[PDB]
Every structure is written in C-alpha cells, then in structure tokens.
Design a protein around this nucleic acid. Sequence first.
RNA 1: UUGACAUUGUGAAGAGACAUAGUUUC
RNA 2: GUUCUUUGUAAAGUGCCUUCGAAGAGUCGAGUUGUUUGGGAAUGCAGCUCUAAGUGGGUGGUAAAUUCCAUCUAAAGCUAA
RNA 3: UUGACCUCAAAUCAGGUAGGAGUACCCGCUGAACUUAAGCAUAUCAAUAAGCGGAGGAAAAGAAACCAACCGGGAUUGCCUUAGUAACGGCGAGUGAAGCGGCAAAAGCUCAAAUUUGAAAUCUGGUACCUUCGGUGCCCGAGUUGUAAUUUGGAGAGGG
Lengths: 99, 58, 203, 51, 148, 193
Amino acid sequence: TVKTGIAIGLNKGKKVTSMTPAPKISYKKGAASNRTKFVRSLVREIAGLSPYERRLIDLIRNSGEKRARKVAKKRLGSFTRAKAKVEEMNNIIAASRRH
Amino acid sequence: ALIENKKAKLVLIANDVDPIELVVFLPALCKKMGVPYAIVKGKARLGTLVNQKTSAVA
Amino acid sequence: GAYKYLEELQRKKQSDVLRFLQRVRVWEYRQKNVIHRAARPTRPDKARRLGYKAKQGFVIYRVRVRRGNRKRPVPKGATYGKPTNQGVNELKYQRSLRATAEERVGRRAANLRVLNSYWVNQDSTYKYFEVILVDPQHKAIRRDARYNWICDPVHKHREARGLTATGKKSRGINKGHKFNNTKAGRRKTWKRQNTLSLWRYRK
Amino acid sequence: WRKWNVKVNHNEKRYATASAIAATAVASLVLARGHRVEKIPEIPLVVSTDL
Amino acid sequence: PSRFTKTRKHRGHVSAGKGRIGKHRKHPGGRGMAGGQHHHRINMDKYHPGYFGKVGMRYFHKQQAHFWKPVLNLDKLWTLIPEDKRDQYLKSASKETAPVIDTLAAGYGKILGKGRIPNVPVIVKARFVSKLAEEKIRAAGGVVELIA
Amino acid sequence: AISKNLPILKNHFRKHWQERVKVHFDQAGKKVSRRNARATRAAKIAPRPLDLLRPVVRAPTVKYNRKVRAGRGFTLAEVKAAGLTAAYARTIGIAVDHRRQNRNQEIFDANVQRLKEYQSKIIVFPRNGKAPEAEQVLSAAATFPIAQPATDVEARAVQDNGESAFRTLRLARSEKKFRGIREKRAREKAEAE
RNA sequence: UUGACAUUGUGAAGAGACAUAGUUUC
RNA sequence: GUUCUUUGUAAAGUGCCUUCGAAGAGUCGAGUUGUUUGGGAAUGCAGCUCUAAGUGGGUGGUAAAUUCCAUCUAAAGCUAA
RNA sequence: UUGACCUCAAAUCAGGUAGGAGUACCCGCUGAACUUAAGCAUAUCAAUAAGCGGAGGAAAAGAAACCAACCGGGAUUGCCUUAGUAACGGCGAGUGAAGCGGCAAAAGCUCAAAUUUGAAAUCUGGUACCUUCGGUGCCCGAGUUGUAAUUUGGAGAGGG
Ligand SMILES: [Mg+2]
Ligand SMILES: [Mg+2]
Ligand SMILES: [Mg+2]
Ligand SMILES: [Mg+2]
Ligand SMILES: [Mg+2]
Ligand SMILES: [Mg+2]
Ligand SMILES: [Mg+2]
Ligand SMILES: [Mg+2]
Ligand SMILES: [Mg+2]
Ligand SMILES: [Mg+2]
Ligand SMILES: [Mg+2]
Ligand SMILES: [Mg+2]
Ligand SMILES: [Mg+2]
Ligand SMILES: [Mg+2]
Ligand SMILES: [Mg+2]
Ligand SMILES: [Mg+2]
Ligand SMILES: [Mg+2]
Ligand SMILES: [Mg+2]
Ligand SMILES: [Mg+2]
Ligand SMILES: [Mg+2]
Ligand SMILES: [Mg+2]
Ligand SMILES: [Mg+2]
Ligand SMILES: [Mg+2]
Ligand SMILES: [Mg+2]
Ligand SMILES: [Mg+2]
Ligand SMILES: [Mg+2]
Ligand SMILES: [Mg+2]
Ligand SMILES: [Mg+2]
Ligand SMILES: [Mg+2]
Ligand SMILES: [Mg+2]
Ligand SMILES: [Mg+2]
Ligand SMILES: [Mg+2]
Ligand SMILES: [Mg+2]
Ligand SMILES: [Mg+2]
Ligand SMILES: [Mg+2]
Ligand SMILES: [Mg+2]
Ligand SMILES: [Mg+2]
Ligand SMILES: [Mg+2]
Ligand SMILES: [Mg+2]
C-alpha cells in the first residue's frame, strides 16, 4: 500500500515498515481440488440436467445469453449466480454438441 | 479409492443396497476408470464369501 | 471414499434419478407411523457429518410433521383485544418444523438424547426428518471420550431447550451486528438492558 | 434502593481529617470534648516508640 | 433530611399547601409531554423552539470516534511542555534546537488559532491545522509537521 | 404536565422497572471474594504467576491508534522468531493467538524482544520430581510492563520548505475528492475515436 | 369463494415457437 | 514426599526439498407473507415458492449495474472462570 | 430340503433409562389487556403478566462465515463507559442498541470429508479367574451401508 503519512488524502495513514504475513489456508476454502473436480464432473454425467437447466440452455441457443441471465436470475438467487450459471451452460453446449 | 487408483481388476456390485445411492455411481466410476465390473444378485452372498452378513461390494 | 459422491449426488434434488428416489421413498414413509424407528440412515453421508457413527448406542428415528402455518387456536377466530392482535391465519411459529420433529421423537425416546437431525423428504402435507440420537446409558457411549459429553445431565432434552443445531438457529445465536438482539440469548440480553444498576456510591 | 452511603470528595475528606488532627493539640478542645487532660504534661502527647 | 422538609411545616393546615379550590389531583395536564402541540404549546415554542419535526440527513450506524478530533488553540500550545522543560525553551528561541511538540501524543487532533504565542520557534506535529494557526506558528519561525 | 422553563428529561421508567433494580450491596463482599479467589488460586498454581504473557499491540481505529496496549496472544510468527513452538509456549505461560497477523515489523520485533526477555527472566522446573522452591512472582504484566514507544526527540532543527502544511491537507483532500471524476475523463478521452 | 404455485406422474390427438425436422407449453 | 514396575524393537517435537491440500445442500441465497428489532428500499425468526457455487461463499447498517478493496470461512460439535 | 439376508414382530426374555416434584436464578414456546398518548385504532404498557415444554449448581454463551477501515484488533460472559447517543416513532406520546476504551475472569479445542487394505487394527454383552469406578482369557454379538489409529484449516497429508 504505502500510506502517504498524512491524516487525509488518498493513501492516508501512518508510514510503518511493513511485513505481508504468511498466507492462511482458511483463505483457500473456495479452491476446487483434483478430487472434487473429478467427482462433480462424474456426478454431472451421472445425474444429468435439471428441469430448469434444460429450459435454460434451449433458452440460450434460441434466445441468447442476455434473456438467459434474466431468466436464471429469477430462478437462482440473483444476477451473479445467474451470470455464472449461464456460463456453466455455455460450456455444457460447447464441449458437448460441438467439439 | 481402489477403482480411482485403477488397482481393481474386477468389481462385484450388489443389486440390493437399499440406499441405492451408495452404489449407483459405481457403474459410471468403473467405466470412466476402465475397471470391469458386474452387478451381482445377492449383497448377502457377497457377505458370505467375505465373512460378513452383507458386503454390498466385493 | 464413497461418501464424497453421495454428498455431491444429493445436491441434485431435481435430477432424474433422485426425484424417482424422492418420489418412491416419500410414499413409503407416509405409509408408516408418523414416528417410526429407522433401520439405518437413508443418508449415511449426512448422518456421518452430523455426528453419527454406526456403533451400538446410536439410534435413527423418522418423523412426520405437518407443513404450513400455525393457525392461532382461539375459539372461532375471536381474539378479544386490539386489532394488531386480531390475526389468526397468517401467523408463522418461531420454531422450525424440524425443531418440532426432534421434539416429538425426543419425547418418544425419553432415555435417548437427541444429537442432530436432517431433512429427507417432503410432500405438500408433511416434511420428513431423520433424527439421530444416542443412548447415554449405553457403555459404548459412556466410554468413548468423544461422545460421553452427551451423558452429562446439562444435555437432558437439548431439543426442548433449543440446544440442537436447529434450535440454535431459531434462537438466533450467532456473532456480530446482525444478531445483537438475540446472541447471549434474547430474553437475558433484554433483562440486562432493562436492569437498573444502582451502586453504593451513586454514580 | 434508597441511598445509604454518601460520596465525599477525597480532598475535602482529607481537609476534614487534617482539621481533626490539628485539633488534637489545642487542649481546650480536647477538654471541651470530654477527655480528662488537666493532669497530663503537654499536648500533643508523644510517648516512647517502645510503647 | 425529612425534618427540614416543608411537609413537616404543613401539618395541621388542611390542604398541604395545595390549595382548597384547585387541589392536588392526579394528572391535570395529562401525563408527561402530552399536548406539546395543543394545550402545552405556548410553553413549547418559547423555551423549546425547534422541538417538533426534522432537519438534515440521517446517518445509519454512525460511530463517534470516526470524528474524534480534539481541538487545541495556540492560546495554550506551550502548556504541552512541562513547565521546568518549558522555561528552558522560551529563552534560546532558535533554529537548530527547537522544541518538538507532538500534539497527537497529547490527545489532540487539530490546532486552531486563538492567538499570541511568543516568538520562540516551535516544531508542531499535528494531524490538522487551521490556516491561521499555522501562519502564526511560522511567524515565530516554527513549522508544522503533518503526522497520522 | 409541561410547565416553566426546564430541560426536557427523558426518564424511561414506564415498564415495571422496580422489578429489575440491582443495588450492589455486595460490592465489599465480592471484592473480598475476589481477593480470596486470587489468593486461593496463587496457592493452587504453584510458583506460576496468576497471569500469562501478553503481546504489545497497536490499538484500533483513528482515536486510539496513537497508544499501544496489551494484546491477547503472540501470533505463531512471533512465537517462531523467538525460537519455540506454539504448543510449548502455551505450557510456559505465554499466550498464543492464531488470529493476529503481523503487518508491522516494529511491533513484530517488540513482541519477539518481549518473548526474549521473558524467556531469560523465567525458570522452567524439570519434569522430574524435584521442584526447587522458587517463590512466585505474582504478575507478568508488572514484571514485563508495556510502555509507549518513543517517537522523537525533545528539540531539533526547524526545516521549513515553505509548503504550508494546512494547504498540503487542502490539496490531499481534493485529489481524493475528484479522483473518481478525473478517471472518468481519462476513460472518456481515451474514446477519442 | 375464486386464481396461481406446490403435492403432480404416463399415453395419445389437437393447438402453440428457433421461423414446415422435435426439446417444450396449454 | 517416598516406593514398585519401564511402558518400547513404542510414542512426540523440530529444519530443508517436492507433490498435494479432501473442508458440512431443500442448505447458503432469492421472492413473498407474518412477527420482531434501534436496524431505517427491510434486525432477527418462521411458513410457502424458487434454489446455488468452488480464484467459491458470507459480511462490509441506502435499493441497483459495473470495477475493485478489506475481512472472515456458514449450513456439524465440546469447554472451566 | 436346508442355511443365510433385509425388513417387521413377540416374550413377566437379560440389563437399563424416562415420567412426578420443585422452579429464586437459567434455556425455549406461547401470549394479553388495564395503562400512556389528556379522546383513539399504528404506538405504548411489553417482545411484560397469566398458559406450555426443558436444565443446572449455575444455566446460556464461547474459539469468529467477529469486529473493523486503524500503525488495525482477535473465543465467550460480565461491570464502568459508550448513551438517553446513532437510530425507531400518528418523527406524536414514546422508544433505543453497537464498534472502540478501562476493569473482572481468562483456555482452549474435535468431528465430517483420506486405502489399515501386508491383514477391523474398534466395540456392547456373556462367562471364568483377578489386585473390581476396572484388568485379563475365551465365546456369542456389533460392525465394511465403516467400528480404530491418522488429520481439523492456526492447518495438515504423501514422498525425499
Ligand atoms: Mg443395531
Ligand atoms: Mg386477548
Ligand atoms: Mg401487529
Ligand atoms: Mg460440570
Ligand atoms: Mg433491541
Ligand atoms: Mg430529597
Ligand atoms: Mg408553613
Ligand atoms: Mg394558611
Ligand atoms: Mg405549594
Ligand atoms: Mg380539600
Ligand atoms: Mg376551578
Ligand atoms: Mg421530536
Ligand atoms: Mg432505565
Ligand atoms: Mg441481590
Ligand atoms: Mg487474572
Ligand atoms: Mg513429583
Ligand atoms: Mg465448515
Ligand atoms: Mg409471537
Ligand atoms: Mg421483516
Ligand atoms: Mg452491491
Ligand atoms: Mg484483521
Ligand atoms: Mg463431535
Ligand atoms: Mg455449548
Ligand atoms: Mg425383564
Ligand atoms: Mg418435569
Ligand atoms: Mg399498571
Ligand atoms: Mg388513554
Ligand atoms: Mg385521561
Ligand atoms: Mg377510553
Ligand atoms: Mg415489544
Ligand atoms: Mg412490540
Ligand atoms: Mg409466565
Ligand atoms: Mg412450565
Ligand atoms: Mg439437581
Ligand atoms: Mg461460578
Ligand atoms: Mg476455527
Ligand atoms: Mg472479543
Ligand atoms: Mg421524544
Ligand atoms: Mg420496545
């Protein structure tokens, strides 16, 4: 960061000789893994698509990734999970019925 | 973890197992790992050969 | 291990295989008595991470509880008082339906102690639960330093006092600014704020 | 919850006891107080530490 | 104490000082602040203009100590040096040795200008200065060192 | 119920407050019980001193940061620079805190030096039997005080570059006020076709 | 009392869109 | 304080290199209803409908879209003063 | 024909446990109105009384999905303060917390998710003896639909 040294302004704060401590593993709680990547990919081709997911990719192909997000935002919690869901569907299509 | 480590040459899966979930993924797993498997009548007969009441897999 | 697949499979409730399962099991459960003992966890992955172990002294019980609101009982809807209290039909009951599920078996097994519970199935009329219990007088449990805390009498009927995980949720027990009203436990923290503290040399 | 004790400012508290000490000389006060002191040598009355 | 109370003096007089005509009743005005807009309004405006209605912005979750900025005028300043050390510094008003006054360390956040410090140079370290406070410091040949 | 010219009081006794009055008649009582508590414990606790070693720490926010104050525990880093592990330091009367981080070297060293002096100034009796009776010091807090680090010198040469202090704040204030806009005009003028 | 959503699944005919292949909805 | 058995071909701590690093779902979350809170485009709680993710998730006391930042690691558990 | 298995039964089957009491204090549910507003419904009384379930010598809370925005702090509980403040409110009558700071007491941790797989290494019970809050030998039994060791994010695990 490097605080400016004054009590207002942009980087406002006291100058101190700084450290950057050792990273905590609890910061990596999200991280995927090779173990869970395999299992989730495996159960996906086991259990397949859910009703709202089928109507989502057909909405994508025949409407696109705007009206998709708008639907998936109503379906899921909100606009960001809807973003990341439509993307997960894009890669359902691409990797499968294509290449 | 055997099937995952490709160490199994044959897997016998029961046709029973009332929480069928414990098993259903094994056909997929054995397939993706190239392990040959078979669905055997008698989860209890898998037990006898292993000295349990019911073995659910051998 | 197997348990990692069950976990991930169960997170597809709308998948074609699980909602065949969901559809058959919920018919069977509804035939059986509203409280009936369960031979094994039908979710051995779920019981497992809630504290269950397959060993003598652990009991699994399956219970129905009717869904929906609590209709304020009252004869004929007549409330006798101010109109803000006139409601009958839309009132919601601060304890979860799962809390009721623990409580009804925890009574049916009075010698057990309720450890945790988990959701299994629901139709429109019922939610279904599997409650995991422990016999505190069974010697496998009285030994076993991991579980014998459950034997101490402080833990008698934890589910009736809101000490299970669900009871803790509905009591609103969590740290931070969203829980100020209910944290140290709501009525206690109320009483604290409403106590007059008079010292010997008045401040 | 009636008021029982009473707060006195530490300093005035001291002033009071100072005043009270200073009056343990002044044989007229000790006399006016009870205290049969006519037959004693001198005030303040100081005594061997051996006591 | 009760023996000095005026109710001891009222014993034997019928009405306890409370009047025969208009008595001492429970709550003739109503209770508390009732009627601030109606029967008690002549007392409310005059003695409390501004009581009713709002002004300005709400601030949700406003933590005092965000705004903590104690204020210290040049009027004092020099009081922040113990008097033994102090007098030593007034004489020998100089560069090359000038007293460092950490006003943050003294518990203050801003230096204002009330007025008149002697001509001794000072090094004043503070978080904030008024414009006049600092001009005056300069006119004695001192400076301000902004800290945080 | 409103008369004369008087402050408007807000006295909340409209609930049943007499029910919840707490008169501390037991002040003197509980002070004794607390003195006895400590005494009974100092005895049970062998020569050990009733309290644990606590780190130097800089107090939070804008109001208190000028002061340094005793923290909870010693941060696995600081424990390690003083050449002992967490598990053992806990048995030695040093408090360890897995949650506190070191972003500041000056404090980091202060706590390692604090750990150094503590290790030197204590004796750790053998596991065996002997217990060579050592006469407890009761504090740690008193033996190892936490003092405000000196930031400067009394007097020193005046350096005026003539840049006005005050208006160095006036300007620092501004640069942050308009930082967002003047970035939008950089965006908007990059779009010059 | 009326509507919607949930409990709610299987066919078949007929309407309905990517715009006259069948995933879908009445 | 003493005193009898050595638990052991047992158990534990620490330095470097390397590969990994499993982490709780009808939950989190959303809508709506009711209640509650100082909590204010919604403080908690519950009903019903919707229902996730894994460089994810939660919070950051004014709703929203975009871009960043800080801070923890939920949906399992014990514990004296 | 015989023997298992799953699930469901019955015994005055072998051994246990629950009820009721009390309830000042404690954990929950449920839930008023009198009252105040000079009338009155939102509000207030009050998240109070009465009603119901459940503990202990304390209960509960507790090792952060915390606070913060600082040079950052660091489980919980409580006191002094924050403060009759921020805020809520026919913005009326009224209501009303939190972060920082001082003090009291201080204490930390364990599971789920991992192939022991060159050896279920674990456990209730019965029984005989013994140095009996237990140990050991042996047999039924539990348990692989997972009982031990190992690991809990502060980490930690497999290699060298
Ligand atoms: Mg059994
Ligand atoms: Mg009523
Ligand atoms: Mg109401
Ligand atoms: Mg105890
Ligand atoms: Mg409150
Ligand atoms: Mg008086
Ligand atoms: Mg008179
Ligand atoms: Mg008269
Ligand atoms: Mg009078
Ligand atoms: Mg009269
Ligand atoms: Mg008259
Ligand atoms: Mg007002
Ligand atoms: Mg009060
Ligand atoms: Mg008392
Ligand atoms: Mg202490
Ligand atoms: Mg010894
Ligand atoms: Mg977790
Ligand atoms: Mg209610
Ligand atoms: Mg609400
Ligand atoms: Mg946003
Ligand atoms: Mg931090
Ligand atoms: Mg546990
Ligand atoms: Mg607890
Ligand atoms: Mg019997
Ligand atoms: Mg009872
Ligand atoms: Mg009354
Ligand atoms: Mg009235
Ligand atoms: Mg009246
Ligand atoms: Mg009336
Ligand atoms: Mg209330
Ligand atoms: Mg209310
Ligand atoms: Mg009551
Ligand atoms: Mg009762
Ligand atoms: Mg008792
Ligand atoms: Mg106690
Ligand atoms: Mg933790
Ligand atoms: Mg704290
Ligand atoms: Mg007011
Ligand atoms: Mg209130």
